[PDB]
Amino acid sequence: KFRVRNRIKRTGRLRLSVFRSLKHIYAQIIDDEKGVTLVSASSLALKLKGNKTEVARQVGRALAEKALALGIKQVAFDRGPYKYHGRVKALAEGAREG
Amino acid sequence: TKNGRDSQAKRLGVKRYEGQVVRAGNILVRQRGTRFKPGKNVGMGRDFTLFALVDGVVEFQDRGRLGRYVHVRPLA
Amino acid sequence: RMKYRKQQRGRLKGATKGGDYVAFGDFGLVALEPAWITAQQIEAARVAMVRHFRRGGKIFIRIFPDKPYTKKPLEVRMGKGKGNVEGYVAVVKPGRVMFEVAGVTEEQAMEALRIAGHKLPIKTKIVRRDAYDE
Amino acid sequence: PLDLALKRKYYEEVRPELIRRFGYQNVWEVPRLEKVVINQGLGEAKEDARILEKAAQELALITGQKPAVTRAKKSISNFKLRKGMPIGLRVTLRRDRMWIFLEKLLNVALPRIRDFRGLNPNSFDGRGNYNLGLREQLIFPEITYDMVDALRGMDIAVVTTAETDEEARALLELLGFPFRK
Amino acid sequence: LLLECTECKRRNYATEKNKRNTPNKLELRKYCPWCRKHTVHREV
Amino acid sequence: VPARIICGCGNVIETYSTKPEIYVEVCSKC
RNA sequence: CCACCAGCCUACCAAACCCUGUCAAACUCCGAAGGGUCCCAGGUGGAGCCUGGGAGUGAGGGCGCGAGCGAUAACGUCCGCGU
RNA sequence: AGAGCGCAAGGGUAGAAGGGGGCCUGACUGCGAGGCCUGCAAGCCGAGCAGGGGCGAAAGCCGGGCCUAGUGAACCGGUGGU
RNA sequence: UCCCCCGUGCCCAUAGCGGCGUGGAACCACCCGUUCCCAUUCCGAACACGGAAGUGAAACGCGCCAGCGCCGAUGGUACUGGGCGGGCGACCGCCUGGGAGAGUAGGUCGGUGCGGGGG
RNA sequence: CGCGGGGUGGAGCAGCCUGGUAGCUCGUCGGGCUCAUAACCCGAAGGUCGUCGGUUCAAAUCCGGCCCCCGCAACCA
RNA sequence: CGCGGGGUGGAGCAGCCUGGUAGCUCGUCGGGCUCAUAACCCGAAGGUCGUCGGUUCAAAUCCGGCCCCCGCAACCA
RNA sequence: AAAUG
Ligand SMILES: CN(CC[C@H](N)CC(=O)N[C@H]1C=C[C@H](n2ccc(N)nc2=O)O[C@@H]1C(=O)O)C(=N)N
Ligand SMILES: [Mg+2]
Ligand SMILES: [Mg+2]
Ligand SMILES: [Mg+2]
Ligand SMILES: [Mg+2]
Ligand SMILES: [Mg+2]
Ligand SMILES: [Mg+2]
Ligand SMILES: [Mg+2]
Ligand SMILES: [Mg+2]
Ligand SMILES: [Mg+2]
Ligand SMILES: [Mg+2]
Ligand SMILES: [Mg+2]
Ligand SMILES: [Mg+2]
Ligand SMILES: [Mg+2]
Ligand SMILES: [Mg+2]
Ligand SMILES: [Mg+2]
Ligand SMILES: [Mg+2]
Ligand SMILES: [Mg+2]
Ligand SMILES: [Mg+2]
Ligand SMILES: [Mg+2]
Ligand SMILES: [Mg+2]
Ligand SMILES: [Mg+2]
Ligand SMILES: [Mg+2]
Ligand SMILES: [Mg+2]
Ligand SMILES: [Mg+2]
Ligand SMILES: [Mg+2]
Ligand SMILES: [Mg+2]
Ligand SMILES: [Mg+2]
Ligand SMILES: [Mg+2]
Ligand SMILES: [Mg+2]
Ligand SMILES: [Mg+2]
Ligand SMILES: [Mg+2]
Ligand SMILES: [Mg+2]
Ligand SMILES: [Mg+2]
Ligand SMILES: [Mg+2]
Ligand SMILES: [Mg+2]
Ligand SMILES: [Mg+2]
Ligand SMILES: [Mg+2]
Ligand SMILES: [Mg+2]
Ligand SMILES: [Mg+2]
Ligand SMILES: [Mg+2]
Ligand SMILES: [Mg+2]
Ligand SMILES: [Mg+2]
Ligand SMILES: [Mg+2]
Ligand SMILES: [Mg+2]
Ligand SMILES: [Mg+2]
Ligand SMILES: [Mg+2]
Ligand SMILES: [Mg+2]
Ligand SMILES: [Mg+2]
Ligand SMILES: [Mg+2]
Ligand SMILES: [Mg+2]
Ligand SMILES: [Mg+2]
Ligand SMILES: [Mg+2]
Ligand SMILES: [Mg+2]
Ligand SMILES: [Mg+2]
Ligand SMILES: [Mg+2]
Ligand SMILES: [Mg+2]
Ligand SMILES: [Mg+2]
Ligand SMILES: [Mg+2]
Ligand SMILES: [Mg+2]
Ligand SMILES: [Mg+2]
Ligand SMILES: [Mg+2]
Ligand SMILES: [Mg+2]
Ligand SMILES: [Mg+2]
Ligand SMILES: [Mg+2]
Ligand SMILES: [Mg+2]
Ligand SMILES: [Mg+2]
Ligand SMILES: [Mg+2]
Ligand SMILES: [Mg+2]
Ligand SMILES: [Mg+2]
Ligand SMILES: [Mg+2]
Ligand SMILES: [Mg+2]
Ligand SMILES: [Mg+2]
Ligand SMILES: [Mg+2]
Ligand SMILES: [Mg+2]
Ligand SMILES: [Mg+2]
Ligand SMILES: [Mg+2]
Ligand SMILES: [Mg+2]
Ligand SMILES: [Mg+2]
Ligand SMILES: [Mg+2]
Ligand SMILES: [Mg+2]
Ligand SMILES: [Mg+2]
Ligand SMILES: [Mg+2]
Ligand SMILES: [Mg+2]
Ligand SMILES: [Mg+2]
Ligand SMILES: [Mg+2]
Ligand SMILES: [Mg+2]
Ligand SMILES: [Mg+2]
Ligand SMILES: [Mg+2]
Ligand SMILES: [Mg+2]
Ligand SMILES: [Mg+2]
Ligand SMILES: [Mg+2]
Ligand SMILES: [Mg+2]
Ligand SMILES: [Mg+2]
Ligand SMILES: [Mg+2]
Ligand SMILES: [Mg+2]
Ligand SMILES: [Mg+2]
Ligand SMILES: [Mg+2]
Ligand SMILES: [Mg+2]
Ligand SMILES: [Mg+2]
Ligand SMILES: [Mg+2]
Ligand SMILES: [Mg+2]
Ligand SMILES: [Mg+2]
Ligand SMILES: [Mg+2]
Ligand SMILES: [Mg+2]
Ligand SMILES: [Mg+2]
Ligand SMILES: [Mg+2]
Ligand SMILES: [Mg+2]
Ligand SMILES: [Mg+2]
Ligand SMILES: [Mg+2]
Ligand SMILES: [Mg+2]
Ligand SMILES: [Mg+2]
Ligand SMILES: [Mg+2]
Ligand SMILES: [Mg+2]
Ligand SMILES: [Mg+2]
Ligand SMILES: [Mg+2]
Ligand SMILES: [Mg+2]
Ligand SMILES: [Mg+2]
Ligand SMILES: [Mg+2]
Ligand SMILES: [Mg+2]
Ligand SMILES: [Mg+2]
Ligand SMILES: [Mg+2]
Ligand SMILES: [Mg+2]
Ligand SMILES: [Mg+2]
Ligand SMILES: [Mg+2]
Ligand SMILES: [Mg+2]
Ligand SMILES: [Mg+2]
Ligand SMILES: [Mg+2]
Ligand SMILES: [Mg+2]
Ligand SMILES: [Mg+2]
Ligand SMILES: [Mg+2]
Ligand SMILES: [Mg+2]
Ligand SMILES: [Mg+2]
Ligand SMILES: [Mg+2]
Ligand SMILES: [Mg+2]
Ligand SMILES: [Mg+2]
Ligand SMILES: [Mg+2]
Ligand SMILES: [Mg+2]
Ligand SMILES: [Mg+2]
Ligand SMILES: [Mg+2]
Ligand SMILES: [Mg+2]
Ligand SMILES: [Mg+2]
Ligand SMILES: [Mg+2]
Ligand SMILES: [Mg+2]
Ligand SMILES: [Mg+2]
Ligand SMILES: [Mg+2]
Ligand SMILES: [Mg+2]
Ligand SMILES: [Mg+2]
Ligand SMILES: [Mg+2]
Ligand SMILES: [Mg+2]
Ligand SMILES: [Mg+2]
Ligand SMILES: [Mg+2]
Ligand SMILES: [Mg+2]
Ligand SMILES: [Mg+2]
Ligand SMILES: [Mg+2]
Ligand SMILES: [Mg+2]
Ligand SMILES: [Mg+2]
Ligand SMILES: [Mg+2]
Ligand SMILES: [Mg+2]
Ligand SMILES: [Mg+2]
Ligand SMILES: [Mg+2]
Ligand SMILES: [Mg+2]
Ligand SMILES: [Mg+2]
Ligand SMILES: [Mg+2]
Ligand SMILES: [Mg+2]
Ligand SMILES: [Mg+2]
Ligand SMILES: [Mg+2]
Ligand SMILES: [Mg+2]
Ligand SMILES: [Mg+2]
Ligand SMILES: [Mg+2]
Ligand SMILES: [Mg+2]
Ligand SMILES: [Mg+2]
Ligand SMILES: [Mg+2]
Ligand SMILES: [Mg+2]
Ligand SMILES: [Mg+2]
Ligand SMILES: [Mg+2]
Ligand SMILES: [Mg+2]
Ligand SMILES: [Mg+2]
Ligand SMILES: [Mg+2]
Ligand SMILES: [Mg+2]
Ligand SMILES: [Mg+2]
Ligand SMILES: [Mg+2]
Ligand SMILES: [Mg+2]
Ligand SMILES: [Mg+2]
Ligand SMILES: [Mg+2]
Ligand SMILES: [Mg+2]
Ligand SMILES: [Mg+2]
Ligand SMILES: [Mg+2]
């Protein structure tokens, strides 16, 4: 079901990989072609509150802070096995503000 | 004797080997299906024709369960 | 049989694979010269053995004629020979084991197999069972 | 709605009883009802879709749940089949929707049956799952005689979590399945 | 059956191929003329 | 939705289903 | 023998499957020698490349080798590599 | 993966090219670096630029169909437009 | 620097199937609920949202066994650039350089890059 | 062997091109008219579509192979 | 390609003219007569008179477009 | 319109 991952790759660079647990959500921009992560704004496993979506937009902006500081811009969003919606969407909502 | 018949043989195959210089647009492989897959700087057309997307050297690669890939590692 | 269609001819390169080892009986008949063996040859050779030791042990044919043999109807030069006049034959390189008997003594086996030699278009040798088993 | 007999009967009676026979370390290892797929095979409705949509509302009504229209694949020329024209309603019951169904099935459907003597004991598919067929369809509660156009019953597939047969075999017995033994 | 898509409020055309008896009595797909830009086209 | 499964054989079961109109002549108790 | 039924099993016909043993131009889990091409190097040769003037040739043949056709016939025939 | 992929075979393919649904008509216009093949003429692949669009949140994808058959120089004339 | 888990890429079965055992602090899953966003040709199965109680059964992670699968030499042979010799032939033999497939001995219940979390 | 045509209830024919659905005449069989037979009248039965394989959801029907029958041809100067 | 006239019951067709009539023939069913068979006779079931729109109180009838068939004439790089 | 024993 990871067919989406393949598409995003052979396309550009800087994958915004996004995993999300039943009580968590993680995001890391990674430059493939060598397999290395640039920035990793973990969420529930970092410090944030309790509302999943509310948490998402926070980490989204959070990632943008540290990421854009290092000079980043390729919004190649790895919409994982998760349909673009709610939590994952809010995560995007965040970076789309930061 | 319903035989004695054929069809104009299409000169297909690997058109540019590994370690060759190529200009952008150069055809790398004309193939039946995807006997070779695209890759770094190598796109393919509706017929499966793999071609260079930029100038550089051509390098091949294999990946077993994943198949063989043609690349163009640039430098100029 | 069943298969599909008429075959090309093909050369008979070295006895490479063409060759085996006894594996069913006490004695064996083996080819020394290469050749296509007709079905009707297999037959005559086989019967020649059973015909010999009547109510005998067991015959083992180890080559099967799967090659379609072609032939023209006595004409000129076109199309491919419908042929099959001899029908089918099996390619046989030197060293290949043809027949094997069992359930009979030396004299029974020696004579019977020897008879097959005369039924075959080949110079042949009889074999015991040495001791060579892989 | 989430509260009635079979649910409780399973938790406050069946659940422990099973543990006494096989003694599971963990709670989940216990056999468990969780899926009931009703399915008619009205290939006859291939032509007239009148019977089709009707039995569809009969079916959805006896179950309360919405009905799905099954399609064809291959082609039984021997009985007018091609791509997917035909049909055979199929509803899948889980959670309470299932329980409420099994309530009527065990206390009303099964009861009034043209000569009932028990369910087939061999009908276990070698893995914690049972299957049974019904001829008449009006043996269900809200199916008056002046409503039936024709006898068009169906078959029900009950799914458990048990592995072995006799393991799930008991599970349905404790619930209320009158096996012929 | 050959077909050439005429433009509305004009008289442009486009290479095409209808299918007649098979479900096709009304062909009105979009296109884009050189005259002006972007317009709906009839069958004809 | 409630339901009055008034069995003819004394029993008077009760569960959930559309319309409380039920009158089973003989149910699981006869 | 047992027919309104049965299995080990039958010097009885056989799908599937298994063991032993094999076959295939149009079958390949494998797979050489070699062949092709590119890079670097040697190679000054009636080598090589570019532009133009002038051609002839377009019945070939034998031999070796690899195949088709033929009959594992023909000073046969048809291609391939070489002479 | 022995199915499927409209039809022959082949190559390819479930990490989709197969099956289902939503919206849509890029079976666009003006071009086209660079090449495959090649005696000529033809045939084939094509990134990218401009215009105006489609689907997608976006990265993006779309100049018909998984691909290789489904075809006919010129001449002469018909038709619509400039 | 060392161990465990989570996300991700690389090698592309020595990574697999199976069997046994182990982990819930954390992590992850399972799980609770269907009001809000979203969803079912039916079903909250799946996708989705809000989240405690429970569990490590399932799944997953880690660790063992070589039954299957998979990998697999050395030696020898086939075959063969090139150079020769022998028969009427179907063919056969030598020199020289290259050298399989099968089979034998054996190997294998993985290795590793980056980031994050926990001790 | 090559080109064309044809194998269908007992006999003689249609259906095939345009795949689903066995048609016609006679004969046969049971029952009626006759003293009886036939004629005539009323009913019914009977096919494996040569054969093997393939196509197709489905083959008398489309496709290929073999067998049988009919005509022509097999010049050879 | 243009021109001409056709679609009406199960089948063939008049009625179209010029608006108020759907008829005939065989066919199918019943009945009458019959050695039988037709012939004859009685009665009967069955047609948006191609399609969609239009003038009209009222058409299948006059009108427009169109579907399909039949025919006429011409052309074919 | 109606052949035969
Ligand atoms: C019988 N003829 C033939 C007259 C010719 N000018 C002369 C003649 O005899 N020609 C004949 C010459 C041989 C020729 N022939 C025969 C066999 C063959 N395999 N190939 C041939 O060419 O067939 C010819 C033939 O008879 O028509 C006439 N009525 N004209
Ligand atoms: Mg993920
Ligand atoms: Mg052919
Ligand atoms: Mg040819
Ligand atoms: Mg050729
Ligand atoms: Mg090129
Ligand atoms: Mg393209
Ligand atoms: Mg394509
Ligand atoms: Mg390499
Ligand atoms: Mg893989
Ligand atoms: Mg000797
Ligand atoms: Mg052995
Ligand atoms: Mg062996
Ligand atoms: Mg289903
Ligand atoms: Mg049907
Ligand atoms: Mg539930
Ligand atoms: Mg057409
Ligand atoms: Mg056409
Ligand atoms: Mg079309
Ligand atoms: Mg268009
Ligand atoms: Mg212009
Ligand atoms: Mg009997
Ligand atoms: Mg008896
Ligand atoms: Mg019985
Ligand atoms: Mg009986
Ligand atoms: Mg019986
Ligand atoms: Mg009996
Ligand atoms: Mg009896
Ligand atoms: Mg009996
Ligand atoms: Mg068998
Ligand atoms: Mg046998
Ligand atoms: Mg077998
Ligand atoms: Mg060959
Ligand atoms: Mg073939
Ligand atoms: Mg291979
Ligand atoms: Mg190997
Ligand atoms: Mg090699
Ligand atoms: Mg090599
Ligand atoms: Mg080289
Ligand atoms: Mg250079
Ligand atoms: Mg040099
Ligand atoms: Mg010099
Ligand atoms: Mg010079
Ligand atoms: Mg010279
Ligand atoms: Mg010279
Ligand atoms: Mg030069
Ligand atoms: Mg020149
Ligand atoms: Mg010159
Ligand atoms: Mg010149
Ligand atoms: Mg010249
Ligand atoms: Mg020439
Ligand atoms: Mg010559
Ligand atoms: Mg010539
Ligand atoms: Mg020459
Ligand atoms: Mg020569
Ligand atoms: Mg030669
Ligand atoms: Mg040679
Ligand atoms: Mg060969
Ligand atoms: Mg030979
Ligand atoms: Mg000779
Ligand atoms: Mg020769
Ligand atoms: Mg050749
Ligand atoms: Mg397989
Ligand atoms: Mg396939
Ligand atoms: Mg399909
Ligand atoms: Mg095939
Ligand atoms: Mg294929
Ligand atoms: Mg793939
Ligand atoms: Mg797809
Ligand atoms: Mg689809
Ligand atoms: Mg699709
Ligand atoms: Mg759709
Ligand atoms: Mg779609
Ligand atoms: Mg729809
Ligand atoms: Mg340029
Ligand atoms: Mg160019
Ligand atoms: Mg060009
Ligand atoms: Mg070229
Ligand atoms: Mg050219
Ligand atoms: Mg020229
Ligand atoms: Mg040109
Ligand atoms: Mg072409
Ligand atoms: Mg483009
Ligand atoms: Mg756009
Ligand atoms: Mg973005
Ligand atoms: Mg494009
Ligand atoms: Mg396309
Ligand atoms: Mg397609
Ligand atoms: Mg498509
Ligand atoms: Mg042409
Ligand atoms: Mg043509
Ligand atoms: Mg053409
Ligand atoms: Mg032209
Ligand atoms: Mg001319
Ligand atoms: Mg002109
Ligand atoms: Mg003009
Ligand atoms: Mg330290
Ligand atoms: Mg430290
Ligand atoms: Mg370090
Ligand atoms: Mg370490
Ligand atoms: Mg890791
Ligand atoms: Mg890597
Ligand atoms: Mg498994
Ligand atoms: Mg444990
Ligand atoms: Mg424990
Ligand atoms: Mg816990
Ligand atoms: Mg609860
Ligand atoms: Mg609530
Ligand atoms: Mg609500
Ligand atoms: Mg559906
Ligand atoms: Mg729906
Ligand atoms: Mg849930
Ligand atoms: Mg979920
Ligand atoms: Mg929770
Ligand atoms: Mg817990
Ligand atoms: Mg576990
Ligand atoms: Mg367990
Ligand atoms: Mg482990
Ligand atoms: Mg593991
Ligand atoms: Mg073990
Ligand atoms: Mg072993
Ligand atoms: Mg060594
Ligand atoms: Mg070795
Ligand atoms: Mg060696
Ligand atoms: Mg050598
Ligand atoms: Mg000599
Ligand atoms: Mg000789
Ligand atoms: Mg020789
Ligand atoms: Mg050597
Ligand atoms: Mg070596
Ligand atoms: Mg090797
Ligand atoms: Mg071997
Ligand atoms: Mg072997
Ligand atoms: Mg060894
Ligand atoms: Mg494991
Ligand atoms: Mg390992
Ligand atoms: Mg190890
Ligand atoms: Mg290792
Ligand atoms: Mg690392
Ligand atoms: Mg770290
Ligand atoms: Mg952690
Ligand atoms: Mg510590
Ligand atoms: Mg410590
Ligand atoms: Mg014929
Ligand atoms: Mg004819
Ligand atoms: Mg005939
Ligand atoms: Mg017939
Ligand atoms: Mg007949
Ligand atoms: Mg007959
Ligand atoms: Mg007739
Ligand atoms: Mg007829
Ligand atoms: Mg006729
Ligand atoms: Mg016909
Ligand atoms: Mg025909
Ligand atoms: Mg047809
Ligand atoms: Mg008759
Ligand atoms: Mg008679
Ligand atoms: Mg009679
Ligand atoms: Mg009388
Ligand atoms: Mg009489
Ligand atoms: Mg009599
Ligand atoms: Mg009949
Ligand atoms: Mg018949
Ligand atoms: Mg025939
Ligand atoms: Mg036939
Ligand atoms: Mg036939
Ligand atoms: Mg039929
Ligand atoms: Mg035919
Ligand atoms: Mg003669
Ligand atoms: Mg002569
Ligand atoms: Mg003559
Ligand atoms: Mg004209
Ligand atoms: Mg015309
Ligand atoms: Mg016209
Ligand atoms: Mg006129
Ligand atoms: Mg009137
Ligand atoms: Mg009258
Ligand atoms: Mg009638
Ligand atoms: Mg008459
Ligand atoms: Mg009359
Ligand atoms: Mg009317
Ligand atoms: Mg009317
Ligand atoms: Mg009307
Ligand atoms: Mg005429
Ligand atoms: Mg006229
Ligand atoms: Mg004209
Ligand atoms: Mg014409
Ligand atoms: Mg007489």
F25 touches chain D (CB under 8 A): yes
d(CA C72, CA C78): 9
Nearest to F21 among D103, D111, D142 (CB): D142
User: Which residues 44-73 of chain A have a CB under 7 Å from nucleic chain H?
Assistant: none
d(CA B62, CA A33): 16
Rounded to a whole number of angstroms, the CA Rg of chain C reads: 16
Phi and psi dihedrals of C12, rounded to 5? -115, 70
How many C-beta atoms lie closer than 10 Å to residue D115's C-beta?
A: 4
CA angle C78, C83, C86 (to 5 degrees): 150
Interacting residues of D88 by C-beta distance below 8 A, sequence separation 6+: D39, D40, D41, D42, D43, D70
What is the side-by-side order of every strand in the sheet holding D90-93? D90-93, D35-39, D155-159, D129-133
Surrounding ion ligand 16 within 5 Å at CB are D 95
Helix (H, G, I), strand (E, B) or coil at B61: strand
The token pair that represents C96 in the structure block:
């290949």
Say if residues B44 and B51 touch (Cβ distance below 8 Å). yes
Among residues D148, D131, D172, D132, the alpha carbon closest in space to that of D61 is found at D148
What's the E38 CA to ligand 86 centre distance in angstroms? 20
Phi and psi dihedrals of C99, rounded to 5? -115, 155
Distances (CA, A) of E4 to B58, E19, E23, E29, E40: 46, 12, 18, 11, 13
Method: X-ray
d(CA D59, CA D48): 17
Scanning the structure block, which residue is given the tokens 């297909």? B12
Determine whether the annotation assigns residue F24 to a binding site.
Answer: no
The token pair that represents C111 in the structure block:
């004579």
Say if residues C14 and C33 touch (Cβ distance below 8 Å). no
The DSSP symbol for D144 reads: -
Q: Which residues of F touch D141 (CB under 8 A)?
A: 3, 5, 17, 22, 24
CA end-to-end distance (rounded Å), chain F: 27
What's the E27 CA to ligand 20 centre distance in angstroms? 12
CA end-to-end distance (rounded Å), chain A: 30
d(CA C53, CA A16): 85
d(CA A59, CA A39): 12
Determine if strand G comes within 7 Å of the CB of C70: yes
Ligand nearest to the CA of B26: 6
Say if residues C87 and C39 touch (Cβ distance below 8 Å). yes
How many C-beta atoms lie closer than 10 Å to residue F30's C-beta?
A: 13
**Backbone dihedral region for residue A71 (phi beyond 0: left; psi -120 to 50: alpha; all else: beta):** left
Q: Which amino acid is at B52?
A: A
The token pair that represents E12 in the structure block:
């442009």
Q: Which amino acid is at D12?
A: E
Q: Which nucleotides of I are covered by protein (CB under 7 A)?
A: 6-13, 26-31, 33-34, 37-38, 41-43, 45, 47-52, 54-58, 78-80, 89-93, 103, 113-117
Closest nucleotide over all strands to A74 (CA to C1'): H59
Burial (0-12, 13-18, 19+ Cβ within 10 Å), D87: buried
Say if residues A90 and A11 touch (Cβ distance below 8 Å). no
- What angle, rounded to 10 degrees, do the helices at A86-95 and A52-69 form? 30
Phi and psi dihedrals of A27, rounded to 5? -150, 135
Say if residues B26 and B44 touch (Cβ distance below 8 Å). no
Among residues C130, C117, C129, the alpha carbon closest in space to that of C31 is found at C117
Contacts with B, C 65-94, CB within 8 Å = 78-80
Among residues C131, C132, C120, C90, the alpha carbon closest in space to that of C29 is found at C120
User: Which residues 82-111 of chain D have a CB under 7 Å from nucleic chain J?
Assistant: 82
User: Which residues 1-40 of chain B have a CB under 7 Å from nucleic chain H?
Assistant: 10-12, 15, 23-27, 30-35
Determine whether the annotation assigns residue F15 to a binding site.
Answer: no
**Backbone dihedral region for residue C46 (phi beyond 0: left; psi -120 to 50: alpha; all else: beta):** alpha
Say if residues A37 and A28 touch (Cβ distance below 8 Å). yes
Q: Residues of D32-59 as b/e, b for ≥16 C-beta within 10 angstroms? A: bbebbbbbbbbeebbeeeebbebbbebb
The token pair that represents C25 in the structure block:
């009986």
CA angle D63, D133, D65 (to 5 degrees): 10
CA end-to-end distance (rounded Å), chain D: 34
